[PDB]
Amino acid sequence: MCLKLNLLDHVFANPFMNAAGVLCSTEEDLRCMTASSSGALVSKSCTSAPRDGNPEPRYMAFPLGSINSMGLPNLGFDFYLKYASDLHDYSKKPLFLSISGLSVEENVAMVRRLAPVAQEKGVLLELNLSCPNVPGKPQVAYDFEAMRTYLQQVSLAYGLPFGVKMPPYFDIAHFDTAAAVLNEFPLVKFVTCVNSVGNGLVIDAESESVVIKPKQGFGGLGGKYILPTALANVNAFYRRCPDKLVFGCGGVYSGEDAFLHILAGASMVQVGTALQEEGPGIFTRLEDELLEIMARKGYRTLEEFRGRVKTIE
Amino acid sequence: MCLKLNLLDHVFANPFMNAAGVLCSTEEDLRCMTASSSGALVSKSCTSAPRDGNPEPRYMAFPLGSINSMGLPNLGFDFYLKYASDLHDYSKKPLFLSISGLSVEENVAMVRRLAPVAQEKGVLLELNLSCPNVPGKPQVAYDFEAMRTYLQQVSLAYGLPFGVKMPPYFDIAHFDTAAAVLNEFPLVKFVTCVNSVGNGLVIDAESESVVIKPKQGFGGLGGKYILPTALANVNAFYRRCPDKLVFGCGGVYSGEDAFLHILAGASMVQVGTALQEEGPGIFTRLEDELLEIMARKGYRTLEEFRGRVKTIE
Numbered sequence: 001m002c003l004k005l006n007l008l009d010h011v012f013a014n015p016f017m018n019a020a021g022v023l024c025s026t027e028e029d030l031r032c033m034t035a036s037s038s039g040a041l042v043s044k045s046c047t048s049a050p051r052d053g054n055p056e057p058r059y060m061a062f063p064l065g066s067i068n069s070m071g072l073p074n075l076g077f078d079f080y081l082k083y084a085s086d087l088h089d090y091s092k093k094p095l096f097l098s099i100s101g102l103s104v105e106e107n108v109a110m111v112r113r114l115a116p117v118a119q120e121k122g123v124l125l126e127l128n129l130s131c132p133n134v135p136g137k138p139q140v141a142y143d144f145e146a147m148r149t150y151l152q153q154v155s156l157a158y159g160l161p162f163g164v165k166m167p168p169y170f171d172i173a174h175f176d177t178a179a180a181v182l183n184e185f186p187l188v189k190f191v192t193c194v195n196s197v198g199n200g201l202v203i204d205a206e207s208e209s210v211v212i213k214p215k216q217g218f219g220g221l222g223g224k225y226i227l228p229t230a231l232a233n234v235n236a237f238y239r240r241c242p243d244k245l246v247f248g249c250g251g252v253y254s255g256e257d258a259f260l261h262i263l264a265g266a267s268m269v270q271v272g273t274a275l276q277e278e279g280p281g282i283f284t285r286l287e288d289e290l291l292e293i294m295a296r297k298g299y300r301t302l303e304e305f306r307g308r309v310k311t312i313e
Numbered sequence: 314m315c316l317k318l319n320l321l322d323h324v325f326a327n328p329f330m331n332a333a334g335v336l337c338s339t340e341e342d343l344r345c346m347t348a349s350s351s352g353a354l355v356s357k358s359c360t361s362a363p364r365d366g367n368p369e370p371r372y373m374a375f376p377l378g379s380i381n382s383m384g385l386p387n388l389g390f391d392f393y394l395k396y397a398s399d400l401h402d403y404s405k406k407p408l409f410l411s412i413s414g415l416s417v418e419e420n421v422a423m424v425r426r427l428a429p430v431a432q433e434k435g436v437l438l439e440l441n442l443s444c445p446n447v448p449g450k451p452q453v454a455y456d457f458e459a460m461r462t463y464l465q466q467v468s469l470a471y472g473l474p475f476g477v478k479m480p481p482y483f484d485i486a487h488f489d490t491a492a493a494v495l496n497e498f499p500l501v502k503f504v505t506c507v508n509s510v511g512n513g514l515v516i517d518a519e520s521e522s523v524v525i526k527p528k529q530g531f532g533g534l535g536g537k538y539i540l541p542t543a544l545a546n547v548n549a550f551y552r553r554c555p556d557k558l559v560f561g562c563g564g565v566y567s568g569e570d571a572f573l574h575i576l577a578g579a580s581m582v583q584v585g586t587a588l589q590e591e592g593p594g595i596f597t598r599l600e601d602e603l604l605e606i607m608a609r610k611g612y613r614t615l616e617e618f619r620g621r622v623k624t625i626e
């Protein structure tokens with residue numbers, strides 16, 4: 001029985017990795033992810049210049065999940081490019097680099113300079129499209145014309161396979177439109193579903209207060225709250241993008257949750273909230289748990305059940 | 314200390330009611346809700362003609378909430394109109410009738426008939442701005458021009474104060490656009506936030522199957538999964554629509570959850586999944602729990618804390 005995968009011309013010991021943003025901002029965090037049992041890691045979404053992000057408290061977690069308005073704190077692109085080019089040990093596992101420029105021009109600037117490193121060292125680009133653009137307009141992936149522009153400019157600038165990180169959608173017409181846009185771009189080889197569920201609001205009953213400071217307490221939701229949403233999106237894109245991979249992200253706490261993602265169509269399975277809460281030991285647990293469900297069911301490999309969710313009648 | 318309140322020129326024993334769709338389809342159901350301790354009741358969204366809805370299984374519940382693709386089963390508008398006009402006992406509590414016509418014309422036709430019953434008996438209209446999927450088009454409340462159309466035509470045809478049932482939004486620009494639409498219409502006197510979170514997917518690990526038959530297992534989510542979404546929408550509209558009331562719906566299982574919805578801004582608090590799972594007994598428990606938390610905090614009225622959620626700094 002084995003959790004091995006070979007995709008995007010890389011070899012992965014297992015499907016598990018962190019979710020962008022969690023345990024991946026500093027060198028220390030990237031070394032820790034690298035030392036862990038995960039099959040891959042992704043670096044924190046970056047911008048051209050370093051950012052401090054939003055005022056604290058800006059992340060809080062609870063039994064059913066988490067809320068955040070981090071505001072894209074990061075060490076700047078040159079840092080993550082240097083980690084990719086000079087520091088990462090690719091003999092340990094593959095690296096994804098996430099970018100999240102605040103305009104199309106910022107993303108173009110970064111991917112231009114990432115290209116040669118991607119070509120030489122094999123770092124894989126994850127472009128975050130659940131990201132602000134002009135304030136007062138929707139985030140990039142909820143503005144299909146902007147999404148198209150972004151993908152056109154980055155495809156031209158970068159010129160190598162990449163993937164995209166998507167927000168969740170909630171309407172079939174949006175699933176249809178979004179996948180149609182993605183399918184215009186042959187270089188988009190993977191689609192990671194999903195980013196956080198936007199603009200949730202957690203309120204503490206005792207203090208009568210919101211729990212994060214930015215944005216009057218509104219923030220993106222992760223964890224147990226979002227698993228059926230995540231699954232839906234994974235499957236919706238898996239069905240609509242047959243020439244792309246789908247990576248699943250949202251609500252993974254256990255090997256059972258990872259199994260569901262994989263039955264929905266996931267190749268890699270990313271872990272955000274649960275990893276934030278439990279720490280990198282989670283990856284040995286998830287591995288063990290997923291192998292046990294496979295043993296019970298008689299599955300020897302991931303391909304035997306990936307995307308094989310049954311429907312009724 | 315009692316929970317009684319006045320809204321919309323009606324008196325309510327307490328702020329609780331069922332969520333549309335739950336325990337409200339048949340005469341038996343409406344009578345059961347009327348006999349309960351709820352402050353109000355709302356009928357099942359209706360269409361001009363009866364509908365059988367989608368194949369079963371079409372609802373399932375779990376520890377964290379529910380998933381449904383009911384397909385708008387209902388007894389048809391004439392039945393609900395007759396309930397409102399001849400059968401409901403208004404001395405017991407107010408009645409809301411939910412309409413969910415499949416085009417603007419259908420909604421106009423129903424509301425033209427409801428108006429004189431509203432004038433005579435005081436039944437209240439809740440217009441549902443969710444709808445069956447139509448390939449190539451989003452749900453009405455996710456198509457702002459369509460929403461404006463509906464509201465323009467209903468307002469003209471109906472001519473009396475009414476409310477609107479909204480799906481959740483996840484993007485502040487969308488909150489700003491939606492609330493601007495709503496505030497064009499002075500007759501929209503309440504906004505109910507939220508309907509189910511659209512197009513989730515629940516998968517059973519043992520069977521490797523989705524759990525509802527319609528739509529390849531995709532359906533609207535309710536219950537614990539959606540509470541922070543629901544609170545966000547309640548507060549976003551409460552902030553943006555100062556001349557309207559906001560009714561909260563989503564994720565209420567306890568008086569503490571009701572308390573949070575009121576702190577976010579809700580005037581009435583609707584109960585869907587929890588009511589479906591626990592039955593109408595839930596309303597005595599919710600009342601007791603909400604009064605207990607009020608007593609512990611020293612609140613004598615709902616007005617003392619409605620919309621008074623605190624932000625940080």
Ligand SMILES: Cc1cc2nc3c(=O)[nH]c(=O)nc-3n(C[C@H](O)[C@H](O)[C@H](O)COP(=O)(O)O)c2cc1C
Nearest residue numbers: 019020021045194195196222223250251271272273
């Ligand atoms: C603290 C924190 C920071 C995050 N930062 C990013 C980010 O920089 N880029 C991104 O693509 N997603 C980011 N996300 C979203 C996660 O990658 C993930 O999509 C989301 O948390 C859902 O997965 P989960 O349910 O496992 O938490 C962040 C989430 C959290 C909790």
Ligand SMILES: Cc1cc2nc3c(=O)[nH]c(=O)nc-3n(C[C@H](O)[C@H](O)[C@H](O)COP(=O)(O)O)c2cc1C
Nearest residue numbers: 332333334358507508509535536563564584585586
């Ligand atoms: C079985 C069922 C049927 C429902 N039908 C309707 C409906 O006819 N009209 C409507 O506005 N909302 C309908 N809903 C949505 C609920 O009114 C409510 O908005 C949603 O379930 C979230 O509240 P909850 O978390 O308390 O379940 C239905 C929900 C369920 C579970």
Ligand SMILES: O=C(O)c1ccc2cc(CCc3c(C(=O)O)[nH]c(=O)[nH]c3=O)ccc2c1
Nearest residue numbers: 045068069070071072073130131132196220
């Ligand atoms: O409050 C702001 O000014 C602000 C500015 C920049 C922002 C950029 C992002 C995208 C990164 C990200 C974040 C984050 O960094 O807040 N959190 C997530 O759950 N997902 C993400 O993709 C998300 C939110 C951001 C908010």
Ligand SMILES: O=C(O)c1ccc2cc(CCc3c(C(=O)O)[nH]c(=O)[nH]c3=O)ccc2c1
Nearest residue numbers: 358382383384385386443444445446509533
């Ligand atoms: O699947 C279909 O073809 C179909 C047809 C008509 C539909 C009408 C609605 C609106 C009623 C509704 C339902 C419902 O009746 O399924 N469930 C909810 O959670 N909220 C709602 O607002 C919701 C879904 C509908 C789906």
